[PDB]
Design a protein around this ligand. Structure first.
Ligand SMILES: Cc1onc(-c2ccc(Cl)cc2Cl)c1C(=O)N(C1CCCCC1)C1CCCCC1
Lengths: 221, 12
């Protein structure tokens, strides 16, 4: 029927950390004002990417139990979930945070930045697909926390300790789906987005092959 | 390796 006091606590802590995330106004302004060319457009995206990583590192550190993990496991989680967590954040920015005029200018910059349509087309399909679900802020926060605390990233020493942090989050999300949408396939649809995000590791890897970025981007990718 | 990443992780 409802979340236990322990599950409410976990959700509260995650929501707090999710709400403290902010895309600077300086960045939204650049989307609107900066010169329109492949080099300038690619440079704005590079800036947005660096900021997403900074925002996601700050969110991750505050996740319940993340700090109890080994420091080397903490880095493997950040490096392994980067691409996936960024797309999830960029989808929320594109679908919910930006005004309708700004989204249009951003799409125009994305499509004219040197990045292949082979990458850009499933990105926008994913954006439309996540937009269709009409996800609450709780669902975006929990999915982001679930993506980050994935126990099957490369170079994780203590996978079991990571599982113990991810599993109660999966339990909370399913319970929320039952409470908010008592549409019984809503959880399965959210899981579908998790597997859809995984395909982006492949499109990003093929893009990287063809220090044009930032030191944080070179380190995390 | 991961010097910038470690810094953001260890700050406060
Ligand atoms: C990973 C990753 O996850 N989300 C993004 C993202 C999406 C949309 C915006 Cl407007 C901004 C970003 Cl950062 C993102 C990423 O880093 N991208 C995107 C690649 C697919 C086309 C859009 C840009 C490139 C990568 C090369 C360097 C420049 C930024």
């Amino acid at each position: 029927m409802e979340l236990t006091p322990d599950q409410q606590t976990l959700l509260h802590f995650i929501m707090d950390s999710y709400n403290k995330q902010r895309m600077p106004q300086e960045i939204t302004n650049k989307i609107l004002k900066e010169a329109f060319s492949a080099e300038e457009n690619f440079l704005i995206l590079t800036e947005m990417a660096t900021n997403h990583v900074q925002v996601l590192v700050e969110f991750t550190k505050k996740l319940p139990g993340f700090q109890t993990l080994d420091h080397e496991d903490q880095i493997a989680l950040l490096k392994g979930s980067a691409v996936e967590a960024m797309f999830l954040r960029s989808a929320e920015i594109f679908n919910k945070k930006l005004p309708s005029g700004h989204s249009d200018l951003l799409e125009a910059r994305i499509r004219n930045s040197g990045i292949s349509d082979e990458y850009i087309t499933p990105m926008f399909s994913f954006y439309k697909s996540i937009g269709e679900l009409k996800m609450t802020q709780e669902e975006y926060a929990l999915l982001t926390a679930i993506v980050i605390l994935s126990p099957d990233r490369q170079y994780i020493k203590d996978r079991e300790a990571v599982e113990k942090l991810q599993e109660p989050l999966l339990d909370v999300l399913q319970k929320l789906c039952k409470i908010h949408q008592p549409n019984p396939q809503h959880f399965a649809c959210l899981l579908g987005r998790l597997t859809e995000l995984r395909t982006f590791n492949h499109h990003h890897a093929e893009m990287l092959m063809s220090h044009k970025f930032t030191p944080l981007l070179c380190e995390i990718w | 390796d991961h010097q910038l990443l470690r810094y953001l992780l260890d700050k406060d």
